[PDB]
Amino acid sequence: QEVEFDIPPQALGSALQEFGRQADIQVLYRPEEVRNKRSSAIKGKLEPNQAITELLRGTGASVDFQGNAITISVAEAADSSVDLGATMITSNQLGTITEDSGSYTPGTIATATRLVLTPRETPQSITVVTRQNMDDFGLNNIDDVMRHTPGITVSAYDTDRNNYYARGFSINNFQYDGIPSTARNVGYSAGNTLSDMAIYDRVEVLKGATGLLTGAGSLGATINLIRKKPTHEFKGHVELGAGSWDNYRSELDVSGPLTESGNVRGRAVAAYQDKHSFMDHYERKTSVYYGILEFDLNPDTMLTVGADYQDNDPKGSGWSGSFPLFDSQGNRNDVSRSFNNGAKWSSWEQYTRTVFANLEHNFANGWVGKVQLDHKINGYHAPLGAIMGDWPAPDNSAKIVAQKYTGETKSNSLDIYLTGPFQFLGREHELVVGTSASFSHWEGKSYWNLRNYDNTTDDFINWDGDIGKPDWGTPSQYIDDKTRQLGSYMTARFNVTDDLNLFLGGRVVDYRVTGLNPTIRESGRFIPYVGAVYDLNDTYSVYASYTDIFMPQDSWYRDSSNKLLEPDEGQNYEIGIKGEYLDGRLNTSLAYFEIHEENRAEEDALYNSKPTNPAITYAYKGIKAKTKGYEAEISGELAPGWQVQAGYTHKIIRDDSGKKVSTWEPQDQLSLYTSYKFKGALDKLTVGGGARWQGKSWQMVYNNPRSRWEKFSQEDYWLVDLMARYQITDKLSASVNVNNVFDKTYYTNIGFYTSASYGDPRNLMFSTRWDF
Ligand SMILES: CCCCCCCCOCCOCCOCCOCCOCCO
């Protein structure tokens, strides 16, 4: 809608960057095309399409309007075949904002290389859950989003921690606005599994081996959460929702200029959710606050200061899964889905806060530089108490394990990078050169020396959580871990021919972990990045890539000789085809991929049967593993009012024994989520459905009372979602979400410490949203 503009005549490059900023729109243009040209003056309250054609007056440029993006082109009478993947400079470093796009497909993305690229231009599997997708299906936290992310499987550790797999691996890489956090373990990682979506525009998941921008990390993927940003027009909304099991959510979101000119701009969001659960005596209060201010120091230098805060505060937390698999005498336990082995007072509260500042500067070069400063906190307060072990006994009694972990992780990050174009052999290429530093410091107390506790409960079958709370005693342990990451990276994107784009880059990494454990060090480790994209038609491109990653091992993972295993490492080999339709409104991708892991930690059963080094009592073995698999996806417009996100993923991951592994992650999965906006009489009704299918999944668990391995199978099952919204009013709308329509009873965990967890039964959510 009508925006306040003030772009005086200047280098067309600068004007377009200035335009993107003022218009809250992503401008994409070609550097060689705008380099010898200037904008004409625009001033005053204008609609952005009126504004841009006015700005482009005299330049010979055309505008392609595409959602929250505009691409500028300068057509010639010549042209010998179009350079679809031509180097393009961009006004927003993080990509296209999805908020208001009305789409389930992203516009442009920087998750791969820092370079702002379309999914079609990216030689990696990149899925995105867009703002609209999130709104439509009421995906209100990262757990919700993951569950709806094609190619991801969400499994439960416990009531307050989920696992996200991709391609055989737990994902343990989280970024915020393209900045990695430290996720060495749940110490550093509190709250990552729980982020509320109220503050985010989209989550982008980069599958494979993502060392280039993550640095040290897990295989599988990176989850990159892009924060909402301030807008140049005032706008906001209040949201209210009510769902099954006393699930209440409220939300506020306010954005706009804070001065008459618009040179300081802010966005604030507050969200609160208090919910019970299908699980007995489990409740959780979550709170989020977020403020961000953008100050324009001048036309081409912006300072951003922001803070965020999320508290996740549950009662009846489990330690491991909802119930034990086997009773005292070896039979499978058969319990309702409402069973919760958590004690009433058991709580794994997790909290997170960020304070962050950026400085962004556009150089009249068409280059941009950006400094990102982060202070992050991941805190936990975890007095846990849960039935665990082989229970009940015949007399229907059980025993509780109780331990308390409190702690905080303080983190500091500096990221500086420079990105821009450059001529070489007559053609335009682009480059990112960057450097990064993070220091993160974990400090905690643990308590396991319970003083005078009677940890037995008299009634398992009617377990309520109604057990006493122990005297925790004095601290049993003081955590003091310190992780230091230093990185330097460079990626070039050479426009080799009119259809060929070659990506060559890498990261050099310095990783130090210091504290109570023997010091872990890796210096000057090189992480290569090699990719190619070949254009086939106006529509299809093929791409191939070789990417890598490592994670220095947990310090308990030592070997036969008490030497720390070499870092857990992997390369992803990928070849595939990407299609782009309707001017980027619909994307399809088909990929074959292979992850070769090496130095994957493993028990070492032959040593461990009778240790022979007094030095180590429980060594680990560092083996190779492989993931073979393929993936198909589609997202975007299928017809005018009709959006989808869908995916198909096949995987098998075997280790150096040849045995299948991550067998709780199904070998085959399908996701399809769709919504349809009607026209004419009922153009105010959005109707929507979704399905998730997954094939066989199983776990080998040991039945202690019978001294034997058992197989726990989860037969293939569907989950069906349904969704409807009515825009009753310009400013007010109502929604219903029904999840798991057929009330499929299934498991999200079998075998995590000999326990099991159910997935959500049929639940509803009703919401109204009020836009000012
Ligand atoms: C050093 C710590 C950093 C703290 C950062 C906290 C930032 C909190 O800022 C919240 C302000 O957000 C502004 C909300 O935007 C609404 C603008 O509308 C104001 C009134 O509108 C006038 C008429 O349109």
Side-chain angles (χ1 to χ4, degrees):
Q1 300 182 299
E2 200 149 306
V3 162
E4 211 88 34
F5 279 103
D6 185 337
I7 304 148
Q10 47 182 292
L12 186 48
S14 274
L16 293 172
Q17 225 93 16
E18 222 167 286
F19 186 94
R21 201 165 277 159
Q22 277 168 51
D24 306 314
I25 254 161
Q26 204 195 19
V27 194
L28 323 180
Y29 62 89
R30 291 166 75 174
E32 90 274 28
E33 277 186 6
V34 305
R35 96 154 92 254
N36 42 359
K37 298 185 199 284
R38 297 175 97 247
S39 64
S40 83
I42 57 156
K43 191 114 188 208
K45 210 196 277 168
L46 295 161
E47 269 170 35
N49 52 5
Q50 219 164 355
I52 186 78
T53 61
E54 205 168 353
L55 191 144
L56 290 177
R57 190 218 159 207
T59 72
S62 304
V63 182
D64 193 10
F65 296 90
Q66 38 192 205
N68 304 332
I70 67 173
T71 138
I72 272 66
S73 69
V74 181
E76 324 286 328
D79 292 306
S80 90
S81 84
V82 59
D83 197 351
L84 274 188
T87 300
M88 296 209 74
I89 275 334
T90 263
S91 65
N92 184 323
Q93 291 306 108
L94 282 166
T96 320
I97 292 166
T98 60
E99 161 160 305
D100 303 340
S101 84
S103 176
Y104 291 7
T105 210
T108 53
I109 284 323
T111 338
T113 55
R114 223 71 145 182
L115 300 170
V116 174
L117 300 162
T118 62
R120 185 190 185 167
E121 290 164 316
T122 311
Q124 268 162 296
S125 288
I126 179 86
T127 300
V128 155
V129 169
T130 63
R131 197 54 262 184
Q132 198 51 54
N133 196 326
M134 258 166 4
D135 293 356
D136 285 340
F137 299 85
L139 311 179
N140 292 143
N141 59 21
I142 191 61
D143 275 348
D144 297 354
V145 170
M146 290 301 93
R147 292 187 266 250
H148 273 52
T149 305
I152 304 308
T153 315
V154 179
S155 46
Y157 287 127
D158 58 40
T159 50
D160 301 278
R161 253 267 153 158
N162 285 150
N163 190 56
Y164 312 139
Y165 297 99
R167 310 186 160 188
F169 299 95
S170 308
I171 303 157
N172 245 108
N173 309 329
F174 292 89
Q175 288 166 187
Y176 307 87
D177 285 335
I179 300 302
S181 61
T182 305
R184 267 196 78 68
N185 59 57
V186 292
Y188 293 85
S189 180
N192 284 355
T193 157
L194 281 176
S195 326
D196 198 284
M197 289 299 112
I199 73 181
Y200 303 108
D201 178 76
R202 61 184 125 108
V203 7
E204 42 206 44
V205 2
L206 189 59
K207 310 214 210 81
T210 68
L212 172 63
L213 296 179
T214 292
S218 63
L219 290 148
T222 289
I223 298 159
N224 177 31
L225 291 90
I226 311 302
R227 277 181 275 251
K228 285 164 179 181
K229 272 177 40 160
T231 51
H232 278 79
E233 38 152 49
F234 171 87
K235 70 161 190 225
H237 63 268
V238 186
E239 213 161 4
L240 287 177
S244 311
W245 323 298
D246 306 302
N247 191 344
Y248 302 100
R249 149 180 285 266
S250 69
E251 182 194 319
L252 177 55
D253 185 342
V254 205
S255 201
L258 277 148
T259 62
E260 55 199 73
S261 22
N263 52 315
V264 10
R265 268 163 278 145
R267 188 154 187 185
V269 355
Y272 175 71
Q273 170 148 29
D274 173 35
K275 60 140 134 174
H276 295 206
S277 172
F278 74 91
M279 279 175 86
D280 197 74
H281 65 277
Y282 180 79
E283 66 151 302
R284 186 159 81 243
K285 302 197 181 87
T286 110
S287 297
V288 5
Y289 310 98
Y290 173 58
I292 173 163
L293 302 169
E294 280 171 342
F295 311 67
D296 293 325
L297 304 160
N298 55 54
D300 46 65
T301 321
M302 196 186 70
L303 170 75
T304 297
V305 315
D308 71 26
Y309 173 93
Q310 185 170 332
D311 184 11
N312 312 274
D313 182 13
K315 249 58 194 151
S317 284
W319 199 105
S320 73
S322 307
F323 64 98
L325 289 162
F326 304 108
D327 72 8
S328 77
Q329 44 174 235
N331 314 314
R332 271 111 188 283
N333 274 323
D334 192 13
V335 304
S336 287
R337 290 187 285 172
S338 64
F339 199 93
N340 179 15
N341 58 9
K344 276 179 150 47
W345 48 259
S346 180
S347 168
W348 185 354
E349 98 89 66
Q350 294 164 68
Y351 73 91
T352 49
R353 52 181 213 276
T354 321
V355 178
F356 64 90
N358 325 137
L359 188 61
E360 188 176 335
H361 179 85
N362 316 309
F363 296 91
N365 230 181
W367 281 68
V368 73
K370 184 158 169 196
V371 176
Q372 269 165 283
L373 267 160
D374 296 55
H375 180 68
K376 188 179 201 176
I377 291 165
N378 294 67
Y380 57 95
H381 177 84
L384 299 160
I387 290 180
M388 103 162 42
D390 307 312
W391 303 113
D395 73 352
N396 201 245
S397 65
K399 291 180 174 191
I400 303 319
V401 164
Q403 305 150 6
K404 184 183 188 154
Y405 306 97
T406 70
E408 210 185 341
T409 297
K410 297 188 203 197
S411 275
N412 285 148
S413 267
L414 175 52
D415 213 290
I416 106 144
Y417 70 85
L418 279 141
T419 213
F422 69 98
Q423 273 209 126
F424 188 36
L425 285 140
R427 327 190 94 268
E428 289 291 328
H429 323 292
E430 51 173 332
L431 180 102
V432 210
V433 57
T435 196
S436 93
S438 54
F439 307 69
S440 69
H441 181 197
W442 178 25
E443 290 189 57
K445 293 159 196 184
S446 308
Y447 299 84
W448 58 69
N449 291 322
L450 322 179
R451 305 285 351 258
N452 291 76
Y453 191 53
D454 174 4
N455 75 334
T456 93
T457 190
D458 54 304
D459 174 348
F460 175 90
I461 281 163
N462 292 163
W463 173 250
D464 221 352
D466 193 43
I467 181 170
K469 173 157 78 196
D471 184 347
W472 301 112
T474 63
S476 303
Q477 177 174 253
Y478 292 82
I479 320 287
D480 200 64
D481 244 52
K482 275 174 151 192
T483 303
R484 206 243 283 171
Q485 251 254 222
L486 296 173
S488 306
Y489 55 90
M490 199 187 303
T491 304
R493 190 177 169 270
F494 297 96
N495 194 265
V496 193
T497 67
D498 281 304
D499 352 303
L500 182 56
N501 291 283
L502 180 57
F503 285 77
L504 286 174
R507 193 185 193 96
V508 6
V509 177
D510 180 298
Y511 198 82
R512 161 165 266 200
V513 26
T514 260
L516 295 205
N517 305 321
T519 294
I520 298 155
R521 223 300 142 85
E522 308 284 339
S523 298
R525 273 258 169 159
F526 185 69
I527 292 185
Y529 184 97
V530 176
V533 175
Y534 187 72
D535 306 335
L536 281 186
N537 313 310
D538 277 318
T539 301
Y540 292 100
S541 286
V542 287
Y543 77 94
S545 68
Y546 168 78
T547 68
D548 180 80
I549 199 167
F550 70 99
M551 176 61 94
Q553 221 89 218
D554 306 332
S555 90
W556 56 96
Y557 288 143
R558 338 203 89 241
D559 71 3
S560 260
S561 319
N562 204 27
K563 271 159 204 167
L564 178 75
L565 284 195
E566 246 99 84
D568 202 323
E569 230 158 303
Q571 307 66 54
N572 173 96
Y573 294 89
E574 201 167 316
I575 192 189
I577 176 172
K578 284 170 153 174
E580 204 189 59
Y581 317 82
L582 310 169
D583 197 14
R585 266 143 49 213
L586 171 70
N587 289 104
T588 52
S589 63
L590 173 39
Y592 180 83
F593 63 85
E594 226 166 300
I595 297 167
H596 293 225
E597 179 173 28
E598 50 279 324
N599 306 317
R600 162 186 267 247
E602 221 244 283
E603 166 204 346
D604 195 353
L606 282 175
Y607 180 81
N608 292 341
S609 272
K610 173 137 82 88
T612 317
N613 202 7
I616 359 121
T617 201
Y618 196 80
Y620 284 77
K621 187 154 123 93
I623 62 175
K624 282 172 166 167
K626 208 185 291 148
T627 299
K628 295 175 185 201
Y630 56 89
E631 193 159 41
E633 9 206 303
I634 181 170
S635 61
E637 178 181 345
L638 279 178
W642 195 10
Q643 284 285 319
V644 282
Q645 188 164 55
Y648 187 89
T649 305
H650 168 81
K651 78 83 157 86
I652 292 179
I653 176 175
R654 303 176 131 112
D655 74 12
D656 259 348
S657 78
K659 87 196 183 193
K660 289 168 165 176
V661 108
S662 310
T663 74
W664 185 250
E665 179 189 26
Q667 300 192 184
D668 305 279
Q669 54 174 314
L670 173 62
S671 287
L672 189 150
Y673 291 95
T674 194
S675 70
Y676 182 61
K677 225 261 222 303
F678 283 98
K679 194 68 229 307
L682 19 160
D683 62 64
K684 287 171 152 300
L685 171 78
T686 295
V687 126
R692 151 83 171 202
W693 178 80
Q694 67 175 56
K696 275 80 178 192
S697 41
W698 66 95
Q699 280 268 42
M700 297 300 279
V701 341
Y702 192 80
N703 178 323
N704 196 16
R706 269 157 211 287
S707 288
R708 77 185 177 204
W709 284 93
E710 296 199 3
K711 193 179 207 184
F712 276 79
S713 296
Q714 168 67 70
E715 267 265 36
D716 63 303
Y717 62 98
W718 295 83
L719 287 179
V720 177
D721 289 353
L722 285 173
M723 165 284 163
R725 183 173 56 249
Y726 200 84
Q727 195 59 51
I728 330 164
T729 268
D730 269 344
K731 302 211 302 271
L732 204 137
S733 65
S735 295
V736 60
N737 286 95
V738 197
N739 284 301
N740 193 1
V741 179
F742 300 99
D743 196 1
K744 180 71 191 171
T745 115
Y746 64 101
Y747 296 99
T748 57
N749 154 46
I750 307 186
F752 183 69
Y753 287 87
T754 320
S755 66
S757 290
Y758 285 100
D760 283 335
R762 188 209 279 107
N763 61 102
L764 289 83
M765 189 74 165
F766 294 87
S767 334
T768 14
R769 183 203 160 107
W770 165 34
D771 298 85
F772 349 113

